[PDB]
Amino acid sequence: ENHSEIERRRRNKMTAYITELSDMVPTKPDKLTILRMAVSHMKSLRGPSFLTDQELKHLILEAADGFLFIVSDSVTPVLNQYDQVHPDDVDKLREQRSFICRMRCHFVVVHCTGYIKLVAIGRLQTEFISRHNIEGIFTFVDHRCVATVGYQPQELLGKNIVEFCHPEDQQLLRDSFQQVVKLKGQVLSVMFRFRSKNQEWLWMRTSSFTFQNPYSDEIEYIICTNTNV
């Protein structure tokens, strides 16, 4: 039954391809007629590679927004256009094959790959976020906090958020932090009062969820995004 099945498999393999070709050509007929009409279509289309260089470049610039430079016309639709690169990257360009740097478009990054013959192409590739430890000591603060609470990031590092909170809510904040650590990655939203530099109390929401290692699932820190409403 091994050989018979293969012949059945091959015939169905051939039969399906017979059907597919007939649908492919606009111009059901018999098999011999199908192949003869296909040969006629090929003879019409024969005027040794599957695609031409123009078609290949069309496919390349449709798949990836790239241009050829040693320049091609496709620079304008994408870039809107040593001197053309970043002043700090001139040393990297001189020694340079594959390199990623910034070129003139306000700077944009350009990914270039090629070989030395140099021929290469260029293909285009109210809330603040802060980090706390398992107990809430500030580990990282983003620039967006200066417009949120007014405190500079330096003055917030090393001090627990609970001390920055109202004394009445300190028990609820501790309970929420324990909950966040226990849930293992489920975000928790808590409404509380955040003191500003001017000591003015602002209503704040906290979205704190534990961050685990992708492999070992070890608690690295808690990501805390805060929105003022």
Binding site: M14, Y17, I18, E20, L21, M24, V25, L32, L35, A38, V39, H41, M42, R46, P48, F50, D53, Q54, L56, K57, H58, L59, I60, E62, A63, A64, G66, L68, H86, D88, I100, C101, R102, V109, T113, G114, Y115, V119, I121, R123, I129, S130, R131, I137, T139, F140, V141, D142, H143, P153, Q154, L157, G158, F211, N213, P214, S216, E218, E220, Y221
Partner: protein, 302 residues
Amino acid sequence: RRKEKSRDAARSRRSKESEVFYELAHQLPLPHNVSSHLDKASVMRLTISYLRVRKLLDAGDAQMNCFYLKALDGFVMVLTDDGDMIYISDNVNKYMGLTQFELTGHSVFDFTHPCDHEEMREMLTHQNTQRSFFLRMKCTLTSRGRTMNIKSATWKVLHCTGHIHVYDPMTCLVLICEPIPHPSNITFLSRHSLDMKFSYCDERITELMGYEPEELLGRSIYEYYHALDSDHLTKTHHDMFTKGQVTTGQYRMLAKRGGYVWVETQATVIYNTKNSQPQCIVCVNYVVSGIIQHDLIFSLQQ
């Protein structure tokens, strides 16, 4: 008498079929010596693929063009909703090992790792059209360049970038799969542990940002990534664990005395050949910018 007459009539058609197929085999834009040895099924497959590609191209409206294939560091694929490589650039053998006439027309769900079928199906289905994902493709090319039998071929990871085309509806996806260079067979280099702590850093790290490598060993890097790239790098690390070779996007790495630097990570896992399990994770990082906004402190370590 009815039995013998049919055999002569039946043998007549087969003789006519072979010349028709030979004519069709010769009509394919291939060398003459290749079309002669090509069996019927391969002729059918290549003809269907060529006709589909021609139909797609005709619906879309000088010596510099020929340089694209060798300059571009990948090989162009075209995939339809069916999953057929209706066109592959002739330089597929240089990067992937397999030869164009063997691959063209075959199912893309066959010549890739079986665990990337779901990702392929999700990316092929169809509002942004950009696609960027990692696909494990079967490789018959050995590290020394010797072509080796497909029945024992090993998997290779490719970074796929392309668009979905809806051409008058029939949909094709045009992929440019690029190889990930292994760091042992080739900006600073590094090396990390399997659960991602630092285990080695190149001495070039000192000049770029002021970090001293001896301080970095033993400390997890997740405290050094900017908070705005945590989920992106987590997805990339999940790709690392699932496949083995991945490439990051543009993310921020914190400096020593202030600011951050934009780096790109081309990280590959290395397996111990004695026992066939992951041992260490090797990363190669591309620094592309200096320290930005050094005047402010962002982290406790800074």
